[PDB]
Paper text:
Using the Au3+-bound crystal belonging to space group C2221 with four molecules per asymmetric unit, the atomic coordinates were determined by the single-wavelength anomalous dispersion (SAD) method. The crystal structure of [name] exhibited a tetrameric structure with a remarkably large (1227 Å2) surface area buried through quaternary structure formation. The α6 helices showed poor electron densities with high crystallographic B values (45–100 Å2), suggesting that the C-terminal segments had flexible properties. Truncation of the eight residues of the C-terminus significantly compromised chaperone activity, and deletion of the α6 helix markedly impaired the suppression of aggregation of citrate synthase. These findings indicated that the tentacle-like C-terminal segments of the [name] tetramer are critically involved in capturing unfolded proteins.
We revealed that binding of [name] to the 20S proteasome depended on its C-terminal HbYX motif. Analytical ultracentrifugation also confirmed that [name] forms a stable homotetramer in solution.
Author numbering:
A (entry chain B), C (entry chain A): 14 to 257
B (entry chain C): 14 to 261
D (entry chain D): 12 to 259
């Protein structure tokens, strides 16, 4: 483990898949979204990523087992000509905020891996932190190439969630949700970032549903959001009582 | 020394040893435990580790001698077919909390070295930070593979110390007590972490006793714990004599 | 992205240019000077630098596009034998304060690249933080070689801007504005540092004009400074009203 | 002038034999650096090489005459005019690697040792400071060595010395930075030598403790060096202290 390493269990017959990322970040939006999507498509884990730039610890898993912090790749093989093969990543962590080089190298490895499957296109998901939400959560969209605005807009027409095409020039997207797109763009890849508005300090199941709604709209997939509905239901009532 | 270096004095006549880790950590628990085990077994020193990821200083040793910070490997050859040979590592320090990469590199070099002797199995010892202790220190256990819970449970049947099989999902073991097992598991190695409840800012001889009772019990060894008892008693006295000094 | 990298779009027909640097720094002085110089000369972009030592984020550009933080090289081809060709570097950022090694790597890569065009001479622009400025901001000068004092002093003869030859021995110039000269010097390159006195916590157009007047005087160019004058006046009005 | 790593720019390969490597880089009280600089001056030691490092702070310094220059270390040699005193290599400079980059300290110290070994260097003397809360008498110099057998050796070079040298006993104490690492890394390569640290308050430029340390050094070397420029500096700073504490 002298560098970031990917352990491969299975080499699935997917072709030109879309790489979807939902690693930990603001309100765990991306992580929830990605975990939900994996569950509903019954995606199969085929690989895990370990990095010596991750925090130097193991985690307690189920049944008293220890394990390094990792990220995991899942695939989904479309049964149609009408839908894309997917690779979804999610995981325990990102590189700590104090090692920028490590983010570049982890993202670099993630990209090298998905490209072996002919991956060209990336969707990242995460949250955008706001002091107060004033209604339904908006989803903020940004792309790697201008011509993709019109492309993702057409695939989004008829969607519940309000997607806002960001115009906050000089704003930043920190960590994998940005770097996979910024580094991917240098090597001929392309895609879109979708960040849901969120208070950020809580697990945000509601904002995760909105993001996943935009993403599944793009993909032309329909999936059950109830699990996320009730999580939002629960945590809302918990917050009531905490502020009393 | 562009990287972590191990200086090896001899190749000991050992095989399939268990690798035991007691580096500095919470309450100096793992360290006291390992040093006591070194001493009672008359384990022999055979290698030392230096690292450019350790703090950039020398320590004053006995006799006005300076030396880089280091870890030390000791071995014990069993006199019989019913006890495993041991490699035991301890030392001055671990890599500082700000250099995660260095922890992986030091742990990885320790694992490469110990596998040269056929090591498969690892036991790590250390502390689990707790706001207060209610009587007898408990020992928390976690393993690298599920099947090993009853393996080690069997070995531990009848032990005096209470051993809790950890259920704190998403809790963390930081540094070598954790990385040796986490990285070891990627290489097909296996083992168990045993961490003792400790206040943490004290040299905790008594929690060290409890961890080392659990470990020697798994090993089939009986080791005299006297010197640890005596250190726990001495530090107990001095602690409460500080709890009276705080009338200032 | 294993290392700091430069992407070359064009190799212009320039030779022995002067390398001018204006990266972000105190007051954004160097950066505003460089951008204004680029705009007024209509200099042309020809290369971009990316680094895994830069902060691990992408930025939002215009029209909802994401990109890695980067630096950009611009050229100006002199139309006559009495002015020098120029390479001007500017960009989003420098390496963060916590990674010294990265500053050296990025500075060394810039110098490798400009040396391909026969660059020996460097002018760095930036700011010098002061607790107050009464009067016009002064520009502090320092050079790589003692014999260059007279050299740039003659070229500065006539200038409105007051240029002080620094004597604060043991003072420091931090980041590219210092490293490009210090590293340059080891390769047989040479040049001068110009730092405008600035309060430092505001975008300092007035001090940018002052540094750029000293630089264009040295280059023998006459540049319209109006856009900077106007920006300076807008910000002084703001500051006066904000103190109220 | 690639700065991918620490690099030494060599001006001359001095005709020197088995020199003693003397280090006096910045640190506590600037004790080692003043001592080195005054030794260089009094001895007319000649500058023969310069060290630059991408692990130094990312800045240039303003020198005399409005000149910028990277931060650097400089190597000076003294050719002994006779077989009764050793040739010397003396290092000093603007700075050491920052406290946050332990790896960088090992790398820099590493390159220094590689360099001096090209000239046959075996023996190292490092000079610096040891922070105290007050000084009661004349400053003492605290000594420690790479090998036990060297205590007898340096102790018999020091008999009749006007400064008092304490063979330190603070087992577990640390020497941080090049003063420690040159000896610590050196002894891994078979080199050897001594640490001399002068008692100092640290926040002040301490010419007096520098004289103490340089007296012990020159003694060990068999050299008589005029200490007056240090005397006068110590005089100046002791009357500036007084008057700065009149106002506070
Ligand atoms: Au790496
Ligand atoms: Au990342
Ligand atoms: Au995020
Ligand atoms: Au939708
Ligand atoms: Au495209
Ligand atoms: Au390393
Ligand atoms: Au470690
Ligand atoms: Au521990
Ligand atoms: Au037991
Ligand atoms: Au690098
Ligand atoms: Au600046
Ligand atoms: Au820089
Ligand atoms: Au002018
Ligand atoms: Au290095
Ligand atoms: Au020192
Ligand atoms: Au000489
Ligand atoms: Au050092
Ligand atoms: Au003496």
């Amino acid at each position: 483990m002298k560098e970031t390493t990917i352990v491969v269990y299975e080499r699935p017959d997917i072709y030109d898949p879309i790489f979807i990322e939902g690693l930990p970040g603001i309100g765990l939006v991306g992580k929830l979204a990605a975990e939900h999507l994996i569950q509903e498509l019954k995606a199969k884990k085929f690989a895990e990523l370990y990095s010596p730039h991750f925090m130097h610890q193991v985690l307690i898993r189920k049944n008293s087992v220890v394990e390094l912090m990792k990220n995991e790749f899942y695939y989904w093989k479309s049964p149609d000509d009408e839908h894309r093969d997917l690779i979804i990543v999610t995981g325990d962590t990102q590189v700590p905020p104090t090692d920028s080089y490590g983010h570049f190298e982890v993202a670099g490895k993630m990209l090298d891996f998905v490209q072996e499957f002919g991956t060209r296109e990336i969707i990242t998901m995460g949250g955008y932190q706001v002091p107060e939400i004033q209604g339904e959560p908006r989803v903020l969209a940004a792309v790697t190439h201008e011509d993709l605005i019109e492309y993702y807009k057409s695939k989004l027409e008829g969607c519940s969630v309000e997607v806002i095409w960001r115009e906050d020039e000089g704003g930043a997207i920190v960590g994998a949700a940005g770097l996979l797109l910024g580094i991917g763009k240098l090597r001929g890849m392309f895609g879109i970032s979708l960040l849901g508005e969120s208070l950020g300090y809580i697990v945000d199941a509601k904002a995760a549903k909105a993001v996943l709604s935009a993403v599944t709209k793009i993909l032309g997939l329909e999936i059950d959001m109830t699990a996320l509905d009730e999580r939002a239901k629960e945590t809302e009532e918990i917050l009531r009582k905490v502020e009393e």
